[PDB]
Amino acid sequence: TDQLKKAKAEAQVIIEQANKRRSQILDEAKAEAEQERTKIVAQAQAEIEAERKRAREELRK
């Protein structure tokens, strides 16, 4: 029937939209994870440099 054909079409849209949404959410999660990893690594680098500076300060006191 035409109602069954409409239903199948809607079903396909639902499946395609769910897949697309998950891809979008995953893409955003990855972008956010990268922003975070960059900040964490930068913070660690700063701590490394700070310790070297402090060590040098103590040695020349």
From Swiss-Prot:
Protein localization: Cell inner membrane
Subunit structure: F-type ATPases have 2 components, F(1) - the catalytic core - and F(0) - the membrane proton channel. F(1) has five subunits: alpha(3), beta(3), gamma(1), delta(1), epsilon(1). F(0) has three main subunits: a(1), b(2) and c(10-14). The alpha and beta chains form an alternating ring which encloses part of the gamma chain. F(1) is attached to F(0) by a central stalk formed by the gamma and epsilon chains, while a peripheral stalk is formed by the delta and b chains.
Family: Belongs to the ATPase B chain family.
Its biological purpose: F(1)F(0) ATP synthase produces ATP from ADP in the presence of a proton or sodium gradient. F-type ATPases consist of two structural domains, F(1) containing the extramembraneous catalytic core and F(0) containing the membrane proton channel, linked together by a central stalk and a peripheral stalk. During catalysis, ATP synthesis in the catalytic domain of F(1) is coupled via a rotary mechanism of the central stalk subunits to proton translocation. Component of the F(0) channel, it forms part of the peripheral stalk, linking F(1) to F(0).
Protein name as annotated: ATP synthase subunit b
